[PDB]
Amino acid sequence: QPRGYAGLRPYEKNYEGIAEADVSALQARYLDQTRGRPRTGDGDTEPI
Amino acid sequence: LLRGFESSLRGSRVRTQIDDKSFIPYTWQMIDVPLAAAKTSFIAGLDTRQQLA
Amino acid sequence: GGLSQLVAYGAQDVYLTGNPQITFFKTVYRRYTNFAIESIQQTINGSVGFGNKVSTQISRNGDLITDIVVEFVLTKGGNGGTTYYPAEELLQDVELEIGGQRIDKHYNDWFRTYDALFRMNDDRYNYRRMTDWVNNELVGAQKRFYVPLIFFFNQTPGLALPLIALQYHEVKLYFTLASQVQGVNYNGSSAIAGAAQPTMSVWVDYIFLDTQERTRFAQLPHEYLIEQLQFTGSETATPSATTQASQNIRLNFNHPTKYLAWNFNNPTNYGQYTALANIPGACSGAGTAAATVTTPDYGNTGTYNEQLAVLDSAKIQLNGQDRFATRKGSYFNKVQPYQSIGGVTPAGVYLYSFALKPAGRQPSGTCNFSRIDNATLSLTYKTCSIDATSPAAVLGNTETVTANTATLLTALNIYAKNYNVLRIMSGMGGLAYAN
Amino acid sequence: GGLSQLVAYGAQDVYLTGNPQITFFKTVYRRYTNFAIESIQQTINGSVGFGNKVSTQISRNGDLITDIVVEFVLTKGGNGGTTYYPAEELLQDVELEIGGQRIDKHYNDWFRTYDALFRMNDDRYNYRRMTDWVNNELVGAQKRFYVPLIFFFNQTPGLALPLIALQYHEVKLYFTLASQVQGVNYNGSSAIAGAAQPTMSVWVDYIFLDTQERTRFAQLPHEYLIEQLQFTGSETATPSATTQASQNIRLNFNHPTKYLAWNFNNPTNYGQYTALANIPGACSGAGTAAATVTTPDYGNTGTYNEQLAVLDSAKIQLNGQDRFATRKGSYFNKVQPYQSIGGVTPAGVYLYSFALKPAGRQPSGTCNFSRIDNATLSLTYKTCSIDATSPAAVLGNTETVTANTATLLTALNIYAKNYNVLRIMSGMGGLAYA
């Protein structure tokens, strides 16, 4: 055969797409607590 | 800060800051290749008007 | 020649070239990773149409995503001059969700405000070309409009969302389409009979990575510094010919904030941040007998004519104390953008930065509202005494006054752009802070 | 899709992506210091008014200062088209004094020249909105103008002036207000009856630093590489309709200079760097019967129509030797800015850079005039043969000529921008070189 393989028109062995879970894992909860009252936090405890 | 600062006084603007130094090392290109030369008897010839036999 | 400059070297050259560190004449480019980019069409769930809510899940075709462009096909319900950025008006809002958690949300008005502040020059014009008709197209004309999104990962490759590292979480976009778009299906308040419903498609630009980089993204945890938009709509302490209205708006913002932005507007006229007037471009029919100052020249809704703006002055207080001296509305309109962005901001749109350069991605000073008990935006309005139908009154007046038609700018939109952290770990993610 | 490109890889790619160093898909942001910025009003000393000299002392409210904006409130003395960047005209000059030493100084004409060369696009447009009336305002209109200052510390935080490190030294701004502002209190040579005096306020944007950063600035010595403006006025070798005027000016300049800049002007009209003509925008009423080539269309004083400029060609000679071959005036007007700035310079304004990027902060080549005895700017002028009242005469003419009205551009302003060092130590500052 006169022409050797030029190498053009290549391919990539075992190309998998990005993993897509079907289970649809639960959303991650936050790390910062809810900004409640800024100056009167955690009750007052009124006396008699 | 107010008196020890260097000012562009006379003597620093002298023309010898340029005229005394040559512009040869700033424009010349490095060669490191030998130049040629050949004898005059090599280009002109041998002058065929010599003797006959 | 140039040689005389090189030779005459002195003491003052030492601080510029002595013990030199760099050159300018030989750039070594950094070798980068092997990657490729592709624009892939998404499937939209729900029916697209005016007033509808639709959504899409971003397909896991590539490893990372950046740019997202929403395509629309709109038609003209009237002639040139009847529409104003209609594709932007149509996309009422977009919400970004990861794993079911809200990450961010943009509004049509935000897109308009954002554009007004951060795009510029031919970027701004090219943008306008993608959302409006700008070559005097006529009724019945059809055009495809591209609305790029402005979520944090849509601005730089540096924040490309690692879909590859989210193996257990879905990523979605929720898009609200406006019930009406000026010059497309409605003209002012009047419906346009026969108006077509928009065609819509969402395109996501994916990055395909080579083996080593894909592996690292899929396996390693990541923390991406992202921007978020906070937004609340408010009633404006509408000014009047008889008074300088004022208002104190407690600012319900949180997180390290780069900047606040706001505008006053006409609730029924998209993009109208200024009063209408009988001066060229400032109203329908301006300059002639038919001029009316109750309806805008829609194609020319935007303006730099501050006289028609309504903010006399403003200050922001933190914990009840002044954060800076009270400045004129024109400060927040012209100077803040000059300093912080470098473009030109349309009248009626204001910016206040807490950052040196909020326009970029790198933090450059922030105001953390999660540590400020009582932040307030205090506004003073201009007096609406100018007879808008008379150029002599409109173009020749004083600093503290505006158009009688400025009382139509009853809506106030206050935005804040802040930082947060998006954490991706073991295939799942969400944000570090709620507030 | 995209995979088809990734696979398209071979030896030619190695130089671009082999042993990769970077990516574009993950940014590391750099943790920065803790600071805040506040806009604080300074008190103006003296008496504000046209032609008056006032001054202000910068208060020690914050630790560092950068941007300075001078507010002015003016009222139109005539209709739209009668003013040209009037807030710029008003701020005749500003001098920067630190520790009693003159550090720098700007002039209204510099603000105009600087703008003409270095601002651009919507920066320039937004910039005009802050110094002029650009929405066809009418007589009596009142506007607050914001004139940013352009001293080294007013352009970048990198050179914020560390007032904190200057505990012993005052930083002052001395301002001269113009005796007249076109379209505000005067119309050409005529005074405008009823014109209001200006209201002025100086705002300084101060940076508040946290403890560690503030302490370092307060205690450590600093060397800030800053830029300064040098400026001298000269009489122009006034153009003539009969020949080509020429001039050779020894420039009394010093220091490593990033660039020279200059213009020719009619001192009567702020910003007029070109000849007047009966072509649209080139004179008051240009294009019609009422056109006068003795007065500019003030709102359109500046133009890109080089026909009305007067410089034919120029060169800079240093100690008797040419620094570069003589180039045409349009080189200095169009090419220099193309190459060095990336903006668009108005006719009549010229630039010659010694720097690769003169518009930036980082030194990129300078000409040190402190080592040059005879720095001479050689100027060749155009012949003012064109009858300015005939638009055909102007618009259809040749390269080497200009308008007969170009002979009115009798003033020459030559600027130079250099680098110096502002040394700060033990609570005091001053310049390393004079």
Short mmCIF file of C-alpha atoms in Angstrom, two decimals, chain B residues 17-18 23 26, chain C residues 1-10 13 16-17, chain D residues 255-260 316-319 321-324 352-356 364-372:
data_model
loop_
_atom_site.label_atom_id
_atom_site.label_comp_id
_atom_site.label_asym_id
_atom_site.label_seq_id
_atom_site.Cartn_x
_atom_site.Cartn_y
_atom_site.Cartn_z
CA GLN B 17 28.21 61.62 29.94
CA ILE B 18 27.48 60.77 26.28
CA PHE B 23 28.21 53.88 20.86
CA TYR B 26 25.38 49.36 21.95
CA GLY C 1 19.07 58.52 18.34
CA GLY C 2 17.58 56.18 20.94
CA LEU C 3 21.19 55.45 21.81
CA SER C 4 21.65 58.90 23.38
CA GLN C 5 18.90 58.08 25.81
CA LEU C 6 20.46 54.72 26.76
CA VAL C 7 23.92 56.24 27.25
CA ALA C 8 23.02 59.28 29.39
CA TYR C 9 22.36 57.17 32.50
CA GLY C 10 22.19 58.87 35.91
CA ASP C 13 17.72 55.89 36.57
CA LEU C 16 13.91 52.51 37.45
CA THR C 17 16.53 50.22 35.89
CA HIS D 255 14.05 63.66 35.66
CA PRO D 256 13.32 60.32 33.86
CA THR D 257 10.53 61.36 31.57
CA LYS D 258 7.96 58.88 30.40
CA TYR D 259 6.64 61.33 27.81
CA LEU D 260 6.35 64.84 26.40
CA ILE D 316 13.30 66.16 19.54
CA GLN D 317 17.05 66.83 19.50
CA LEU D 318 19.27 65.88 22.43
CA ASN D 319 22.61 67.62 22.92
CA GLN D 321 21.77 64.78 18.05
CA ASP D 322 18.45 63.83 16.61
CA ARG D 323 16.47 61.56 18.98
CA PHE D 324 14.35 60.36 16.07
CA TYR D 352 5.73 61.79 22.02
CA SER D 353 6.45 58.88 24.32
CA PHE D 354 9.75 57.57 25.53
CA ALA D 355 7.79 54.78 27.24
CA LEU D 356 6.28 51.64 25.81
CA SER D 364 8.39 51.18 30.72
CA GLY D 365 11.22 53.32 29.44
CA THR D 366 12.13 56.90 30.25
CA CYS D 367 14.26 59.77 28.95
CA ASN D 368 16.25 61.28 31.77
CA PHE D 369 16.52 64.96 31.12
CA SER D 370 18.62 65.41 34.22
CA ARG D 371 21.47 64.14 32.06
CA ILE D 372 20.65 66.14 28.94
#
